[PDB]
Design a protein around this ligand. Structure first.
Ligand SMILES: [Cl-]
Length: 263
């Protein structure tokens, strides 16, 4: 019996819906430590400690670009911190540092009796997500910190595509028509570089660079996949093996690839 399993048995429908089982609240971090600003989203009623995920935007972008993930993930049983970077013009390595600073601060607040998330986090179970350079920053975080349980960047941008050292389970969301971080020269070579992990490549048909951002038209699919990946790998929750590993057989997806990921 898995000590990290939370919530009811999943269905496609429950994972495609606006929200999972748990009530979500949020708060602004009053004194961000090592990054620009943060919002923490958390379940009030998960039934046990949950893992933490830190989410970073792209170059020029702010929390609004990626924060639809906050309630979506938190409602399925995660503490989620969405950040602004110290500068909108921070590069990937800096973004990685800031992402891990955010995780650190979540751990601090877990141990702070006045915090809404006092005692709600399992600080041994953490994941990383982010858009574009924030996606590159997530992969750098995974490479440098292999104790992370999951990595799920979207439209990742990085000046080097070789992430062959990564042992963290990694789901790459790619946007087919991305002109900023082109699938063929960024997301795909990243994906292909990783031979040591569970990994997945999901390309959204016709997607611009912002295809997985807040307000996108594919929240059912993208949120199903993001939540299933985090549940399978952050919580070791094999109820989610099929959702995490399966080809979703969607006309919204124009390329699907996965490895070391059994349904
Ligand atoms: Cl970017």
């Amino acid at each position: 019996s898995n000590p990290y399993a939370r919530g009811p048995n999943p269905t496609a429908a429950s994972l495609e819906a606006s929200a999972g089982p748990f009530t979500v609240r949020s708060f602004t971090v009053s004194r961000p430590s090592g990054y620009g600003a943060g919002t923490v989203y958390y379940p009030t009623n998960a039934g046990g400690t949950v893992g933490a995920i830190a989410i970073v935007p792209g170059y020029t972008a702010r929390q609004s670009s990626i924060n639809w993930w906050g309630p979506r993930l938190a409602s399925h049983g995660f503490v989620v911190i969405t950040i602004d970077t110290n500068s909108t013009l921070d590069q990937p390595s800096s973004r990685s540092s800031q992402q891990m600073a955010a995780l650190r601060q979540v751990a601090e607040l877990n141990g702070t009796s006045s915090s809404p998330i006092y005692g709600k986090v399992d600080t041994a179970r953490m994941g990383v997500m982010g858009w574009s350079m924030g996606g590159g920053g997530s992969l750098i975080s995974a490479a440098n910190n292999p104790s992370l349980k999951a990595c799920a960047p979207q439209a990742p941008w990085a000046s080097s595509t070789n992430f062959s050292s990564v042992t963290v389970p990694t789901l790459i969301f790619a946007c087919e028509n991305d002109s900023i971080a082109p699938v063929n020269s960024t997301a795909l070579p990243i994906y292909d570089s990783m031979s040591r992990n569970a990994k997945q490549f999901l390309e959204i048909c016709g997607g611009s660079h912002s295809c997985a951002n807040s307000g996108n038209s594919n929240q059912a699919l993208i949120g199903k996949k993001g939540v299933a990946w985090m549940k399978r790998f952050m919580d070791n929750d094999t109820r989610y093996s099929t959702f995490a590993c399966e080809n979703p057989n969607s006309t919204r997806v124009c390329d699907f690839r996965t490895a070391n990921c059994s349904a």
